[PDB]
Design a protein around this ligand. Sequence first.
Ligand SMILES: Cn1c(=O)c2c(ncn2C)n(C)c1=O
Ligand SMILES: Cn1c(=O)c2c(ncn2C)n(C)c1=O
Ligand SMILES: [Ca+2]
Ligand SMILES: [Ca+2]
Ligand SMILES: [Zn+2]
Ligand SMILES: [Zn+2]
Ligand SMILES: [Zn+2]
Ligand SMILES: [Zn+2]
Lengths: 524, 524
Amino acid sequence: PWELTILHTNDVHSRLEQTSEDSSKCVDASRCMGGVARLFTKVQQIRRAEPNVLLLDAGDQYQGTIWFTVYKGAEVAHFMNALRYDAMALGNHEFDNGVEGLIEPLLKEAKFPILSANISASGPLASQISGLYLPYKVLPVGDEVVGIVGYTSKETPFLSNPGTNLVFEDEITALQPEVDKLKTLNVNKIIALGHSGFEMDKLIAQKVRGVDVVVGGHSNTFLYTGNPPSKEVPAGKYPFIVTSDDGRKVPVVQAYAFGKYLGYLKIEFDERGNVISSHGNPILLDSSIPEDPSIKADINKWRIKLDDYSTQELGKTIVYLDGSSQSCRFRECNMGNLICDAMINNNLRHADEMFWNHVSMCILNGGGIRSPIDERNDGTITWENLAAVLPFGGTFDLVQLKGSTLKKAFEHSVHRYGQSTGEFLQVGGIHVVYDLSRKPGDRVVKLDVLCTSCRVPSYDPLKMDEVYKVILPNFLANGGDGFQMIKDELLRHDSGDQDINVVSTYISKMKVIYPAVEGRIKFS
Amino acid sequence: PWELTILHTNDVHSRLEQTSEDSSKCVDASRCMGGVARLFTKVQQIRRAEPNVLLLDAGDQYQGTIWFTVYKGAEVAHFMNALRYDAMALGNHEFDNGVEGLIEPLLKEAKFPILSANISASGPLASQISGLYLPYKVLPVGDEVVGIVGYTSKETPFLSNPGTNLVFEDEITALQPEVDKLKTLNVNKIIALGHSGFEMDKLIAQKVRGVDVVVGGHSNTFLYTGNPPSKEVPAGKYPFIVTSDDGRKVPVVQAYAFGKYLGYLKIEFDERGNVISSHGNPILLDSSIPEDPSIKADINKWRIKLDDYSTQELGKTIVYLDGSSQSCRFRECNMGNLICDAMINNNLRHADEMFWNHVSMCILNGGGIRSPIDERNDGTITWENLAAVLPFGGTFDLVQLKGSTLKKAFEHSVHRYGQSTGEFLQVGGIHVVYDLSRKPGDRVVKLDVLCTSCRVPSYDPLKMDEVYKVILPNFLANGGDGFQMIKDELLRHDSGDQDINVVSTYISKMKVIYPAVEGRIKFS
Ligand SMILES: Cn1c(=O)c2c(ncn2C)n(C)c1=O
Ligand SMILES: Cn1c(=O)c2c(ncn2C)n(C)c1=O
Ligand SMILES: [Ca+2]
Ligand SMILES: [Ca+2]
Ligand SMILES: [Zn+2]
Ligand SMILES: [Zn+2]
Ligand SMILES: [Zn+2]
Ligand SMILES: [Zn+2]
């Protein structure tokens, strides 16, 4: 039997430095985790011991911290080249800075193949991009070869900025002929590496004949066999075994997100490329593993430009930005209006004749707004100021919610009004009226929402059975601040851009901001 | 007696081409008026007949048509140099593109002195601008000399974009020492040429000892002795005689606006520089005066770049821009919200610790919105599209109104609701609720306005005795669409920027717009 070691990361999301336990800023180094210097140590160790090793990334290196804001992907090419990745699949966030911000910094600078079989271009762009990403690569491994076929979320146009040329094809439809073609070229060991989420990974394992292993991403899925090593709760065993339509057992793996874990799967193949066995587990990259000193020194050198950037002017405000708890946990506050407006602006994507924009609505718990910004520093706003308001290193995500769920959320928002609790909601594209003289649970007396399926945006009553797209913190999509109804009832959830980066982009674009308190939230 | 002919223009406001009777676009050439080609004919004629002639401009050449949008003052330097102006005073609108847009195109390219005695600079800007404008110029005229002393509205920081360095001093305080100094240099014939408005011109005539003639602007004041030649109603005789504190008679002149008239004042002086007599009248520049063929040919050549600019993309909309009468004369319409938002953005000026901005409020009669803009031309908006919405060539002006006046205006807005009349108001920084079941005159049941004297903008009830700044069309400041209460009751009125230019600037800055109907106007 020929034994392959697959080492894999996904959704690293700009966690170049070691992080806290919850993948925010590292404060107590003896409890910090991940980062590329520690990943380098562990990959180097495994490559010393195991003969046949591939190091794979299933996409979404782009987006998540100030590293991406400043270096725009040059950090990804540099540090992935230093760790000697063997292949990467394109994720949705690789399109955040458009095609041009993918071609230049990543596709031209990576020393490893970048893959996606389900993205096609036309016109001049097809000539410009030809060969800079590939459907698959056949890689030598010891005295064998392994085919790696890539795939990217078909939902990328809703979740990033790929532009109107590129077309994202159904993953299974695009993959099967490429896997068919590898079989005709005598490549009998095939890894599908891609970025569509755990549910689609299982469907690919089931339906794409000839795929031996699926290495995925997007859904930040944690799989584990045994007692979990940290706080993440497993969605299933590692690997997750799918019974294929061709009647094989196909292992499916993912490794959470944020560089906290290194996926590690050992596959035994027979002489005909059939998987005889598969076993492994993700490795927690905790402080017991030292940071490679050379990578850490390069990381500290690259940090200098980040520190310099963090105190530069992004834009100006001519208004005080009231992010005080006394405002934002009790009533409409202008800092909440600013952040929700920035969240909606971040989610303007290219539209059908069917909507002016696919999403119009935002909610933000006042518990998430942690500072005001004073306008009397010559109106200057810096990144450092925004990091005081939004200190948790979260994302602003897209969810689909029934109107009944969202009405429940607005009831939760005031269920114990008066105590300075964090669940009080700041909004965009939503007008709510409360009557606090009613029983908890029955205090929302008006709730109107901004249409999407309309050429002129206007407000309509919320409908209980209708499914709304909403931009909201990752923290609330995960039921934070008591919003269990959101976690339990949401129909779709895709992670979005870093919270600070959303607001800093909007302020940069606007140049001069003056958000008002304007009646989005009233009390009767 | 030594006889001087003063020819003078003021508030020409980018009317390089001949205009209609009401100073909008020329449609029936046999009834058109003004423009620099006709002004050239008439000035040339007078210079052939009269020995001692000065051609003076009292400021506000900048701003008013697409000529300024595209050429940014290069057209002013070019055509004023062709007509051989002898001197110009700085107006407020000369600061519309900041100091840099005054230095370069006008102060560096004018072949005639540019004057203002009441503007001072400090730091590097004082070195950069030194001598490029002057307090006064002594000009040879035949075998005599005439001193010309300049002045500019002290209110320029509220009415344009001069920046935070320049300081606008009280006109009379700044002028007297300069006039004193000319007396010490044996210059006994002194013209005050400046841009502060008719009321301040009369105060200067009264109080600045040694001034013999005041040639002013800003207030678009029409003076006439006799039957008026056109539709403009005189504010007083030409010249308007002020009895000075030193007990002389001092003539004060102005010549309306828009290049429609050439001011013409004949002054007889005695050997000691005392005015013995003054007489004249503005000359209507009507079609009986031919356009100089050489200037007209240069005008037609420069127009090519205007026609080219007018079809270029300014920005995009992802929403239909509903400027239909069926919407904007009956309810809140998103095109009205766009234009009011653009009007408020145009009026962001540099602020004290005392306000976030000096003005927060806008009203726009639906009668002034004349077209929608379809978003299905790839979202493109051009100047030509905006000219369909705003076809009258007006300005968006700043007025001060008591809250009682503005409540009267909102009652007028719905006094005969239901007939598709133009007075129905679109708004910004104002939330109004009507109850149409009440008697005409008593239908406004809520009227809340955006604070200025506040660090966080929020809405408060309108107060009847408080004076509000409002941005609104020139047409309404003049009582158009039945708003007689605005014309009769306003406490201050300064003309602002061209209507189309305000909206095109905002769209350019924003890049992508998506104005909503959001509850600024409701019905109970
Ligand atoms: C209140 N709150 C938290 O307490 C929090 C968080 N992310 C992590 N934590 C712990 N966010 C975004 C938040 O709003
Ligand atoms: C309705 N209306 C007019 O009729 C008009 C005008 N300017 C001139 N006229 C005639 N404006 C701006 C306007 O709103
Ligand atoms: Ca196989
Ligand atoms: Ca005199
Ligand atoms: Zn991701
Ligand atoms: Zn993803
Ligand atoms: Zn003017
Ligand atoms: Zn003026």
